[PDB]
C-alpha cells in the first residue's frame with residue numbers, strides 16, 4: 001500500500017476502538033482527510049490481534065458506498081495503522097443532536113435504505129457484521145450512512161457452523177443468541193437494524209436491558225413471549241426455560257406509535273422471532289416503505 | 301434454512317468462484333524452489349493435520365493454512381530449515397482467522413519442539429501477512445463441499461465425511477492437486493464419495509449450480525480416484541488415522557471402488 005506515516009498530519013483524537021485510539025488525519029500531498037486506527041502491536045505478546053486480522057482481510061474485499069473504506073494498512077514492525085475514509089459523525093451522536101426535533105422521516109428512510117444496501121452486500125460476500133449499533137454507523141455531510149467497525153465481523157460458510165456466543169452489543173442482540181442456539185446467521189444483523197430503525201424514530205433504544213435475562217424479558221414484553229407456533233423449536237433451545245413469563249404480543253402500532261403502516265410492516269419483519277421468517281436485507285430493499293425514498297443530506 | 305442463507309447462497313457461491321481464481325497458488329512453484337520439494341510439503345501438511353487434531357481445530361483452519369503456505373511459497377524462496385516456521389505461522393494466522401478459541405502463540409512454539417523461538421514465529425506471522433497483503437479470506441474445498449452437501453436427496457453422513465476426507469487427502473500432494481481449483485476438487489471429492497457410498501453420481505442440480513459435469517470433472521476425478529486407491533500405501537497417514545475416528549464415521553475404513561465407469 002502506497003502509504004507512509006510522513007504524508008499524514010494528525011488533526012485530533014476522534015474516539016477509541018478495540019486496539020487503541022482513532023485520530024482524524026490529513027494526507028499532506030492529496031488533501032484527503034482520513035481516520036487512522038492505530039494498533040499497538042508492542043502491547044500484543046500474541047502477535048497481530050485476531051480482531052485486526054479479520055477487520056483488514058474482510059474490509060479489503062468489501063468495496064461498497066455504504067461500507068466504510070479501508071484505504072491502506074501501514075505495517076511498521078512496531079505498530080499497525082489502518083487508514084480509513086473519514087466521516088464527520090456517527091449515528092448515535094447525530095440522534096443526540098437531533099433530539100426535540102426528531103430525525104425527519106425522509107432521512108430515516110434514506111438511512112435505513114442505505115444500511116440495508118451495505119448489509120446485503122456484506123451478506124452477499126459471506127460476511128456477518130455482528131455488532132450493528134448506531135455508534136458503528138457513520139454519516140457524512142452528503143447524506144451517506146456507512147457500516148463501520150468490522151472488528152467483530154466474521155466470514156461465514158454455507159450452511160453456518162457454530163461461531164462465537166459473545167456477539168453483538170446487548171441492546172441490539174437477537175433472541176436466537178440470547179437463547180444460546182448452536183447456530184446463528186445473517187438474521188442477527190437484521191435484528192440489529194430492526195432495533196436501529198425503531199431507535200431512529202424514537203431517539204431511544206428499543207430494548208435497553210442490563211443483563212441477558214432482562215434483555216430477553218424486555219423483548220418478550222414488547223413482542224410477546226414466543227411459543228412453538230410463532231417460532232418452532234424455541235422451547236427446545238439451550239437457554240429457554242419453561243418458567244419464562246408468558247407476555248402477550250402487543251399491537252405493533254403501540255411499539256412505535258409515530259410509524260406509518262408501511263414502516264410498521266417492515267419493522268415487524270425485521271423483528272420476527274423466527275430467524276427463518278425474518279426479512280433479509282436483500283428482500284427488504286423492495287419493501288413499499290421505500291417507494292418514495294430519496295437521499296437528503298443530514299439536516300444539522 | 302436461514303442457516304443455509306437461502307437469499308445469498310448463489311451470490312456467495314459466485315463470489316467464491318471469483319475469489320478462488322484470485323487466491324490460486326502458482327502451479328509448479330516447487331520446481332522454482334531450490335531447496336524444498338513436494339515430498340517436504342507433504343510432510344508439512346501431514347504434520348499440520350496432526351496439529352489440528354491435537355488442538356481440536358476446525359477442518360476449515362487446516363485448509364486455510366495450506367492455502368496461505370502455497371501462496372507464500374509461490375513468491376518466497378524458503379530453505380528446508382525454515383519450511384516449518386512458514387507452516388507454523390500459517391496455522392497461527394488461520395487459527396486466529398477461523399477459530400473461536402485459537403491456541404496461544406506459545407502453544408504453536410511448543411509444537412515445533414523449540415526448533416523456533418516465539419520471536420521467530422511472530423515475525424514470520426508478520427512476513428506472511430505482508431506477502432499475502434492480509435488477503436486471508438480465501439475460498440477452501442470445504443466452503444464448496446458444504447454447499448454441495450445441500451444437494452443430497454437425502455443427507456448421508458457417510459457421504460459428507462468421505463468427501464471431507466478425500467478433499468483433505470488432496471492437500472497433501474501438490475502434484476497433481478495444485479493444478480485444480482477448490483471448487484473442482486470439491487466436486488470430484490463429492491462425486492467420488494457419493495458413488496462409493498450410495499452408488500449415485502454428480503446431481504443435475506449441481507450441474508445447474510456449478511456448470512461442472514462429469515466431463516469437466518473427469519481429469520481431477522481420475523487423479524482423486526488414484527489417490528484414494530493408493531492412500532493406505534502413501535507415506536503420509538495422518539489423514540487416514542484422523543478419519544478412522546467416529547467423529548467422521550470411520551470413513552477411511554470404507555473400501556474405494558475399483559472402477560468409476562466414467
Ligand SMILES: OCCn1cc(Br)cn1
Pocket residue numbers: 005006008009010023025036
Ligand atoms: O510518527 C507519527 C506519524 N503519524 C501519526 C499520525 Br496519527 C499521523 N502521522
Ligand SMILES: OCCn1cc(Br)cn1
Pocket residue numbers: 014015022035037068084085086087088089090138148
Ligand atoms: O467517527 C469518527 C470518524 N471516522 C472513523 C472512521 Br474508522 C472513519 N471515520
Ligand SMILES: OCCn1cc(Br)cn1
Pocket residue numbers: 223224225226227230248249271272273274
Ligand atoms: O415474531 C413473529 C410475530 N409474532 C410473535 C408473536 Br409472540 C406473535 N406473532
Ligand SMILES: OCCn1cc(Br)cn1
Pocket residue numbers: 339340341343344380381383384387
Ligand atoms: O528440514 C527437513 C526438510 N523438511 C522440512 C519439512 Br516441514 C519437511 N521436510
Ligand SMILES: OCCn1cc(Br)cn1
Pocket residue numbers: 343344347384
Ligand atoms: O525431522 C524433524 C524435523 N521436521 C519437522 C518436519 Br514438519 C519435518 N522434519
Ligand SMILES: OCCn1cc(Br)cn1
Pocket residue numbers: 320321323324325363366367368370438439440441478481482
Ligand atoms: O493449495 C492451497 C489450497 N487452496 C488453493 C486455493 Br485457490 C484455496 N485453497
Ligand SMILES: OCCn1cc(Br)cn1
Pocket residue numbers: 001056060070071072073074075429430433434
Ligand atoms: O500488507 C499491507 C497491504 N494492505 C493494503 C490493504 Br487495504 C490491506 N493490506
